[PDB]
Amino acid sequence: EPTSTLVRVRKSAATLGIAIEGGANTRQPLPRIVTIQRGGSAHNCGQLKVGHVILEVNGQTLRGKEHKEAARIIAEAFKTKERDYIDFLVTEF
């Protein structure tokens, strides 16, 4: 029934290059990508597209996380030197 896909984003630029909306209490219960900036790390990936709903980031689920906290997880996952990547479990729903 559900449809997930894992997109791994390599860090080829200084910026992530995405914009997200939603979280807990919002009309969009899960963070949804609205813009993908040209030149950014996300733009090089290609597979990541606008409208994709992010369920998990590096294994951590965004279900139940408020927009503020959801943004905190993604920003920290990009700033971190542990990985040279950022795993996203995204959906078409």
Binding site: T15, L16, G17, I18, A19, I20, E21, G22, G23, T26, V34, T35, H67, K68, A71, I74, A75, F78
Partner: peptide
């Protein structure tokens, strides 16, 4: 009355 949007 809010409509959040975070840029990275």
């Amino acid at each position: 009355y809010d409509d959040e949007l975070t840029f990275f």
